[PDB]
Amino acid sequence: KADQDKMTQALVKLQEEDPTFHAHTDEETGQVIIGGMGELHLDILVDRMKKEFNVECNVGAPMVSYRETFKSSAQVQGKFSRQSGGRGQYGDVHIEFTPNETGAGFEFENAIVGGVVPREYIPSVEAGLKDAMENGVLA
Amino acid sequence: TMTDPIADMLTRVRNANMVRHEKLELPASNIKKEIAEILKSEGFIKNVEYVEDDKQGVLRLFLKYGQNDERVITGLKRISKPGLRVYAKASEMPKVLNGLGIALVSTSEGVITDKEARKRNVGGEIIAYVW
Amino acid sequence: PTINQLVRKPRQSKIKKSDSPALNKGFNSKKKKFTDLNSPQKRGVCTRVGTMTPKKPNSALRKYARVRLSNNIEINAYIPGIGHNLQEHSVVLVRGGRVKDLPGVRYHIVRGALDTSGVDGRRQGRSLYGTKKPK
RNA sequence: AAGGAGGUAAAAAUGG
RNA sequence: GUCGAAGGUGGGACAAAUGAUUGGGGUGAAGUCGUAACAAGGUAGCCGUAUCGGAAGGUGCGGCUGGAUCACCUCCUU
RNA sequence: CUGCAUUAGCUAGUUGGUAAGGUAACGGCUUACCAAGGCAACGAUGCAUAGCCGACCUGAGAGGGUGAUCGGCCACACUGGAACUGAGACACGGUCCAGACUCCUACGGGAGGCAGCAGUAGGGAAUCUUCCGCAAUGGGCGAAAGCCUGACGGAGCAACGCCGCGUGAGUGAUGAAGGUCUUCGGAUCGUAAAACUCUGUUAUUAGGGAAGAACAUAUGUGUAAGUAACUGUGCACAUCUUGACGGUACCUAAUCAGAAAGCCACGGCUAACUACGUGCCAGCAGCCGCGGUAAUACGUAGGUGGCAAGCGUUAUCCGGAAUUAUUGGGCGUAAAGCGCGCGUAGGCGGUUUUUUAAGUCUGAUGUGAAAGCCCACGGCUCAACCGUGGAGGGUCAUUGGAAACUGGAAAACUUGAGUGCAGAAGAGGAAAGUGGAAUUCCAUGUGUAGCGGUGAAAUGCGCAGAGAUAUGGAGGAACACCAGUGGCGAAGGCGACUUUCUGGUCUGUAACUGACGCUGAUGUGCGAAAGCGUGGGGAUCAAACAGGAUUAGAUACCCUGGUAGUCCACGCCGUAAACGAUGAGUGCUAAGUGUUAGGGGGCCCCUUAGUGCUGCAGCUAACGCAUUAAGCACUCCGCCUGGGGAGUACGACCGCAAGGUUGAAACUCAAAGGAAUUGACGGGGACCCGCACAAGCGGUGGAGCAUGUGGUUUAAUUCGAAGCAACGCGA
RNA sequence: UAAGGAACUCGGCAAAAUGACCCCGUAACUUCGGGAGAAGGGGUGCUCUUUAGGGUUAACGCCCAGAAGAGCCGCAGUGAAUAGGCCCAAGCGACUGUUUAUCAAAAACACAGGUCUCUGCUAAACCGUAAGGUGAUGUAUAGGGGCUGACGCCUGCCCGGU
Ligand SMILES: [Mg+2]
Ligand SMILES: [Mg+2]
Ligand SMILES: [Mg+2]
Ligand SMILES: [Mg+2]
Ligand SMILES: [Mg+2]
Ligand SMILES: [Mg+2]
Ligand SMILES: [Mg+2]
Ligand SMILES: [Mg+2]
Ligand SMILES: [Mg+2]
Ligand SMILES: [Mg+2]
Ligand SMILES: [Mg+2]
Ligand SMILES: [Mg+2]
Ligand SMILES: [Mg+2]
Ligand SMILES: [Mg+2]
Ligand SMILES: [Mg+2]
Ligand SMILES: [Mg+2]
Ligand SMILES: [Mg+2]
Ligand SMILES: [Mg+2]
Ligand SMILES: [Mg+2]
Ligand SMILES: [Mg+2]
Ligand SMILES: [Mg+2]
Ligand SMILES: [Mg+2]
Ligand SMILES: [Mg+2]
Ligand SMILES: [Mg+2]
Ligand SMILES: [Mg+2]
């Protein structure tokens, strides 16, 4: 890892030398990927980085960013109470989770009647759902 | 113990002037007597008397107050001190209060005022400022 | 103090510290050492890019980058303006000037220098954000 | 008559 | 042959980097436990020292007033 | 001419002498001998950093910062050593050796040193052309023409800086269109624009076109030294020729307002305000801060402000900062007086006389290069710039003068400081001895069921006879009244009495010494309590500890016990709010009134030294201090420089240990603090009042019933009211 | 005993190596004694010249004993023999000592030091039926027994059971 700066500089010089060789960072995986015209191309470029630029590097198959989803629908409830100590905090929600049509994305609907949930906290509920779904629930 | 008789004399004069005393008795010395004579000549004090007694004698100053009881002496400041002595050239002689005051000096030609030092083109140890 | 005391131990002035220490140091690779040199900016590589929460009473998601400088010192630099195109391994120019809200952020990333792009849609004070004249 | 200094008792539930 | 750079061997000195692990320190958002201090802060507080206790802290010994206070005598000032 | 003591010892050819060798030269420069010298708290040695200066930036100055360009001096030339040649080198583009590194090779062997000028790679935020010419100045060689000269003279690139000029000027209300705001009238961009007229700095085109150039050499004469006389040589006057820049600067003629304005800011500091979007988000920010629906602080638009071929940001230095204070600050409570003595070096020092001239003052001479800064003048059209004079700049050196002060020498004085003589008080210290009260324990007689304790309790002690009471004994510790803003001591501290040894202080006298003094780094001692070691002692009290109680809990406060310790001897530790939070010495500056120990003059007056209170002038942010200053002055010492981090870490020294002394930084905040003011509050106080107590009459609480309320139940038992100030209340 | 040099082996077992005298020099740590012969290095024969000395003697003489220089020889001079290998760490026991005669020498025992406990003297404890003895011709700073085991810093809670 002490040679990552040398690796970046070598990649820059090599991209200026060869138009067909590309290097980019993937945000999701936080990995740097090198694209070439073939196995021979990438092998020669790896060896040239190792020797000419004195940056020994290892290469592998790029990691694939997976996603999760719900296959079954269900009504569910969550209730958090923290009144035992000091300040007391109460929250309670009842949400139906449904498998959305593939590719439609997350969809939040607010079927609140009677103001049981103050309208002030509904955006907070949506933000909590978004954070929690950003964090995986299975893997 | 005592370390600056000139300082002490000036401080006696200052304290008496503050309290608006009329006379002032201090132990005498040649330098104190010359300073007192310079003050009398310049007009800051009324009179000077010397008592030639034993134990070095005494100097009896009589202070001068103007009309409305105003004080003729605004302030006296010791310049050269035992801890750090100050000397000046003829061309570097200081003017007290833009000339409205005197700087008492000690010179090869006797202790005189800064005006006389500048006139005779001499320097020396700046004993005190008075204004 | 007495004059004699000053003469024995002279007066000593308070020493002044730099607000941007990371810019005052260069690095010699051959001798593998640091060297004292005052610089107005330094190149660096963004080790991390992200957001930080300011201290009270302010509230926000302030954009910043953890940068390794050319002298091997790792610092937090604020990213000014609306929107930025920085990620890890981006090469950025860093100048002095801390962000009062952010505790450990003592430098700024220059906009419109090296990889960093100018602020898109900026029309007043454009030089401060590296935006060309639209015309 | 009103203020400054020293000694010296007797009393006491708990939470705001 | 003398002197003699570099080199070799040896035990020490000094400086810097780095090190499993470890120590307290600072900062931080509505965190948890109690409530030490500020009123006599509900056991006056603080200083030095010792020991004890989750924690603030408690307790003992000496010291300070930078301590409030009802009744008493003892003087001193106008 | 530099930082560190968290570097105190260094030095053995080292210091000196003798002899010799060696060198341009003196010399431990080197060697032989003899000696033990030399340096150092006036900072040696060690470590770190650094070329020095003229100067440059800043500042009113004093100062602070810096050491690019240009000039001087030094040092170095891949690293180290060496010598050769030479007048000169221990030699950048020389030699030899060694080392590291690199290159060529036919593998036998060879070669190299850009910190010369360009340029390449690398590092970096960042710094240029592998340019033209020796025409000018200078240098080397040559008799000279001349050759060489990446010195130098030029050109190229870079807004990098400074200076200069542009991007147009006059008229122009008819306030044109259009943007923005609007109170829907209008305001503003705005004489701005349009249009008419004018100029060409600039720009384009075409012509003319410098100076810098002196020369040298060569050719003619004239003159001067020498010659027997020429050629030659010196000098003088003439003539041909010599330009990289460059057909550049500059000048002339014609054409066109036509090609030539951007940056930041507009909440306060700080010149400049409005509308929209956003809505503690996005964002801004040097500080204070701004942003959650009315944002002059975020983004855009109009307008405005400051600058302008520049404008902003970052970095660094000085300033503002008197925020290290010599100029020019402080230490009672804001940071700061060592806990206190004794005392070394150093700093400072009473009065008079004579003398010296180190400091001090004054005149002359030399020098402080040039360039620079400042003043003046001159030349580029101006300016920057260039040139020329002046002035300035030393803590400089030599020399001649003055003697008041500081310094040196000599001689006197008694006022300060000590001593003698006559007196005074004292819980000053050390060691032995004696004594009364009280507590605890032990033994015994009488005696019964409690004692003790607290807010209330319980633990505990007691039916074995407790507690109480009486007598006797054992032992330890402290000394009731006197006792007092009283006394003594440097401080800590010292309180029964007696004896022995011993310290200090105060009063009067004026013989006696004659300045012998003050302060005091480093050092050396004492130093409350706790604590430690050894050996004793052990009543009381009492950390730890056990039990009881209180409490939501109670590792406490309270209660019952209880060990170390509290006491003694000898050692150790060396710290306290060790405080007057106030260093020591000295003198001066209104007063009133106590008290302690004296003295003098008539209950009174005066006076010395303490100890208190009140209070002028003066001081202070205020509180307050105020002859026992925190006033006015002088000397010396110690200490401070925002709050945390931290009295911490590291190093050092001390300690048995506990720890003590010395003592940072990174990082973090914009505060932390003092005195005083107004409120509010207090499990602070004083006083005053009220059917608040008290005096008294009658009630409620007890019974039945009416009604309201809580609870429960129900389909609902509608909702509201909850201490006083909800409950025959909204009703 | 070539080259190698722990690759051997459970293990460097054995062997090898060091070894004398003089000189230089010598660390952490420490209870300040030490560690230490630390470590790590240099010298060592013979001849001659010059020369400071000490003991014994009138002296000569005899004996002891250095210093400097110049030479000579060998592969090699404490020329043979005899004469420490050293260092860095960890566990255990403080240390010198003692022990299974004849398979165990150690970390076991002992130890100086600590503490508990008994014992007022015809002591307690021990031997013996007793007499008589040890203890001790001692007397609580003494004597017996238990446990611990230099030194340094310490040694907490429980008395329900025995
Ligand atoms: Mg409390
Ligand atoms: Mg309290
Ligand atoms: Mg306790
Ligand atoms: Mg250097
Ligand atoms: Mg200033
Ligand atoms: Mg050369
Ligand atoms: Mg070269
Ligand atoms: Mg070059
Ligand atoms: Mg680069
Ligand atoms: Mg200043
Ligand atoms: Mg303070
Ligand atoms: Mg004091
Ligand atoms: Mg202290
Ligand atoms: Mg000059
Ligand atoms: Mg004690
Ligand atoms: Mg108790
Ligand atoms: Mg103090
Ligand atoms: Mg008095
Ligand atoms: Mg072999
Ligand atoms: Mg093996
Ligand atoms: Mg063996
Ligand atoms: Mg053993
Ligand atoms: Mg055996
Ligand atoms: Mg055996
Ligand atoms: Mg044992």
Q: What one-character DSSP code corresponds to residue B45?
A: E
Q: How far apart are CA A96 and CA A74, in angstroms?
A: 6
Alpha helix (H) residue ranges in chain A? 4-17, 39-51, 122-134
Q: Could you tell me the distance in Å between the CA of residue B57 and the C1' of nucleotide F384?
A: 75
Interface probe with A: pick from C48, C67, C89, most Cβ of A within 10 Å: C89
Phi, psi of B57 (to 5 degrees): 85, 180
Nucleotides of E under 7 A from a protein CB: 27-34
Cα separation, B123 vs C131, whole angstroms: 70
Question: What is the per-residue DSSP string for C76-128?
Answer: EEE--SS-----TT-EEEEEE---SSSTTEEEEEPTTSTTPPPPTT--SSGGG
> How far apart, in whole angstroms, are the C-alpha atoms of residue B61 and residue B130?
16
Nearest CA in chain A to C90: A8
Q: Chains with ≥3 Cβ pairs under 8 A against A? A: C
Q: How far is C70 from chain A (nearest CA, A)?
A: 10
Half-sphere exposure for B43 (CA within 13 Å, toward CB): 7
The number of domains in chain C is: 1
3-class DSSP state of A129:
helix
C60 and C115 Cβ atoms separated by less than 8 Å:
no
* CB proximity list for B10: less than 8 A, separation 6 or greater: B76, B77, B78, B128
Listed by the residue before each break, gaps in chain C with C–N over 2.5 Å are none
Method: cryo-EM
Note the CA–C1' distance, B121 to F249, in angstroms: 61
CB nearest A25 (choices: C68, C88, C91): C88
C68 close contact with A: CB closer than 8 A: yes
Cβ atoms < 10 Å from Cβ of B23: 12
Structural domain harbouring C99: 1-135
Q: Which of C34, C35, C43, C96 is nearest to C70 (CA)?
A: C43
In the numeric block, the tokens 């109470």 are attached to: A81
The C-alpha atoms of residue C22 and residue C76 are separated, in whole angstroms, by 11
In angstroms, this model's resolution equals 2.5
Residue B66 CB partners (closer than 8 Å, separation 6+): B72
- Cross-strand pairs, B60: B25, B49
Give CA–CA dist C125/A5, Å, rounded. 34
The CATH architecture to which A1-66 belongs is 2-Layer Sandwich (3.30)
Q: Do the chains A and B touch each other, judged by at least 3 C-beta pairs below 8 angstroms? A: no
| d(CA A8, nearest CA chain C) in Å | 7
Task: Tokens for B131, please give them.
Answer: 């204004």
Strand E within 7 Å of which CB atoms in C 103-122? 103
Give CA–CA dist B118/B7, Å, rounded: 24
Q: At residue B31, what are phi and psi to the nearest 5 degrees?
A: -65, -45
The amino acid that residue C59 corresponds to is S
Question: B100: Cβ–Cβ under 8 A, 6 or more apart, which residues?
Answer: B131
Cα distances (Å, whole numbers) of residue C16 to A69, A109, C11, C108: 59, 60, 16, 22
Give the number of other CB atoms < 10 A from CB of residue A35. Answer: 12
The helix (H) or strand (E) run that includes residue B34 is helix B30-42
- At residue B89, the 3 state secondary structure works out as coil
Lookup result for tokens 């893997």: A139
Q: Considering only alpha carbons, which residue of chain A is nearest residue C70?
A: A5
Chain C hits for A32, Cβ within 8 Å: 89
Q: How far apart are CA A54 and CA C97, in angstroms?
A: 37
Alpha carbon distances (Å) from C64 to A27, B9, C100, C108: 16, 72, 13, 9
Alpha helices in B43-88 (DSSP H): none
* Euclidean distance between CA atoms C89 and C45, whole angstroms: 6
Chain-centre distance for alpha carbon B130: 7
- B to C CB pairs, distance under 8 Å: 4
